[PDB]
Structure 1
Amino acid sequence: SIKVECVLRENYRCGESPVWEEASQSLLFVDIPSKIICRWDTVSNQVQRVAVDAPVSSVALRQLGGYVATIGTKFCALNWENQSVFVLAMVDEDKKNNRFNDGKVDPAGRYFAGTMAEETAPAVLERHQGSLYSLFPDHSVKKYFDQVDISNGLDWSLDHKIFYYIDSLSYTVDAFDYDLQTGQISNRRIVYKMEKDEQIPDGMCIDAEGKLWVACYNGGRVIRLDPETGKRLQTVKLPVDKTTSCCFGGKDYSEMYVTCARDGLNAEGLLRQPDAGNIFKITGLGVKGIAPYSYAG
């Protein structure tokens, strides 16, 4: 009953940060090196893009209206109507060549996002240059920890007491104790160790049963994980190797959207993966996800 299909054939270089906007039945996402934030209306099937002036690594809903995004090393606010973009806060000012990577809004409306050194090739970069940050609703920025290689997938337990986090080049999914009222975290530990054939852990989202789904970059799959036991529950393969992230969307969050990349593929790889860069949808997983939180500033 599980069905994997390519639903948007736009050939992004590195599709990332899919977010479901139920108010419009649209998928928001980015194409990082193409410097565009995209909004795909799934019913009219039209895509609108907002071009920005540096690589844009994530996008999130903004409660008061419009969107927020991480552009370069800056948290930014976007008005979709006039396409105006302005800076809310900047991080890593002491770094010569960093950028934000994955980000997501916590259950209290704080925009978490972490950084990385810029790559010369996939996973080829100066080590330990990133940090995890969050933009609070008052536009202040909290720095959580440094020494990150590539800040990636992240989400929160349904009871709002645990934060899950991926630094891609650590090859583990980690968990922290998390305090909803203050946004503080502590007690970092490993909850899943990636197997060799699962390649690089990238984006991540939680489902309604508290299990984690992780996109496996170079692994051509998403895997479902139980963070309580440390065991993989399920693998769903896709016809593209560089699967980057995933989120739930559609009616009652019953469908999974998966982004992927064509950057880093050679000519042979492009031919073997004609849908590299496209958006996929997975139906029939038999579990639902949850709605994204909106930034509260």
Structure 2
Amino acid sequence: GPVVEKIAELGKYTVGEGPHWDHETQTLYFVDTVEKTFHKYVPSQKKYTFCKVDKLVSFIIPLAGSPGRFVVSLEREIAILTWDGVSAAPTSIEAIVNVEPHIKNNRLNDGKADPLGNLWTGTMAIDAGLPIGPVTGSLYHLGADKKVKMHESNIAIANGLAWSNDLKKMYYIDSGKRRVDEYDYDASTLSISNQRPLFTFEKHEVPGYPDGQTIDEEGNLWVAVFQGQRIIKISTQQPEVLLDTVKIPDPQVTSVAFGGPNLDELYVTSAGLQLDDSSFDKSLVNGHVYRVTGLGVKGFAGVKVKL
């Protein structure tokens, strides 16, 4: 079976999240969504750095055409951070837009660029809860003239995103729904329609909650299972098809991104945050980063945000 390696050099994270593989510099970026920190790992040189801010963060994506600059979330603001990748604080911060200026207890959560470079991201209550809690989030994309457009509401925990290779489908996770949804995606109008369930956890006895996801070159989705101690591989050709399961030692698996020189090593983040209603004892919940090899598939390099 696949080899799952704990990345010792990286330590433990409260809620490690938002992995992004920059293929030209062979570098993994990621965040901690509770500790207000950004992280950089260069596997070939065993180099790790971090950056501290004073707002909650949930994604970090290189800015297309601007080395040393990243598009990030700072609470409810989408911003450009100028960061040399090694100093413990940003050089400067340029706010782009506040997506929800008058919802004081919301935050941005997962974000990713579509294959065209458009940033998509969703919000949630800071005090969201599973299985039941306040449902206050929405799904946005950042469009022309730095204005966002809204595509879906009534989202409890805005999470993983992916797009099909032919640009006809988008896949999206609200963790509270315990399913992955598929949508028809119109790349020319950047609109989504015909929402329907692709994969429903209860139909397949999958525990936990879907969190982050990514898609491989064959069109399979790889989904992180929070409180499931696993990643799952699901079909996009047929609804409700579980293709494979890979166990990850950490129970609270949060997200996934393909990386390595040949885009065939799957990086997996997890959360060490100990929750009061967990299905796993505290001794099991650590928050390591993992690397999975031997899956027999390749993914895609992480896409930069175009502004």
The interval holding the TM-score normalised by the smaller chain is over 0.9
What corresponds to 1:181 in structure 2? Answer: 188
Counting only pairs closer than 5 Å after superposition, residues 1-297 of structure 1 correspond to structure 2 as 1-7=1-7, 8-65=9-66, 66-81=69-84, 83-119=91-127, 123=130, 126-136=133-143, 138-195=145-202, 196-229=205-238, 230-265=240-275, 269-273=281-285, 276-297=286-307
Per the alignment, do residues 105 and 154 of structure 1 end up closer, same or farther by CA in structure 2, a change over 3 Å counting? same
Considering only aligned residues, what root-mean-square deviation do their CA atoms show, in Å? 1.8
Count of residues in Structure 1 that have an aligned counterpart in Structure 2: 294
Paired-residue identity, %: 37
1:72 partner amino acid: E
Question: Conserved in 2, the CA contact under 8 Å of 1:128 and 1:146?
Answer: no
Runs of 4+ that moved beyond 4 A: 265-268
Tell me the distance in 1 between the aligned counterparts of 2:59 and 2:186: 24
Using structure 1 for the length normalisation, give the TM-score.
0.94
Question: Conserved in 2, the CA contact under 8 Å of 1:119 and 1:125?
Answer: no
CA deviations on 1:108-142 (whole Å, 9 max, x unpaired) are: 1111000000127x537743200001112532211
Question: Conserved in 1, the CA contact under 8 Å of 2:123 and 2:138?
Answer: yes
Displacement of 1:160 after TM fit?
0.5
1:253 partner amino acid: L
Tell me the distance in 1 between the aligned counterparts of 2:216 and 2:153: 28
Counterpart secondary structure, 2:274:
coil
Question: Conserved in 2, the CA contact under 8 Å of 1:108 and 1:181?
Answer: no
Question: Conserved in 2, the CA contact under 8 Å of 1:165 and 1:174?
Answer: yes
CA deviations on 1:132-182 (whole Å, 9 max, x unpaired) are: 011125322111121111110110000011010000000110011111122
Counterpart secondary structure, 1:291:
coil
1:263 partner amino acid: L
Per the alignment, do residues 220 and 9 of structure 1 end up closer, same or farther by CA in structure 2, a change over 3 Å counting? same
Question: Conserved in 2, the CA contact under 8 Å of 1:55 and 1:71?
Answer: yes
Displacement of 1:227 after TM fit?
2.2
2:72 partner amino acid: A
2:219 partner amino acid: G
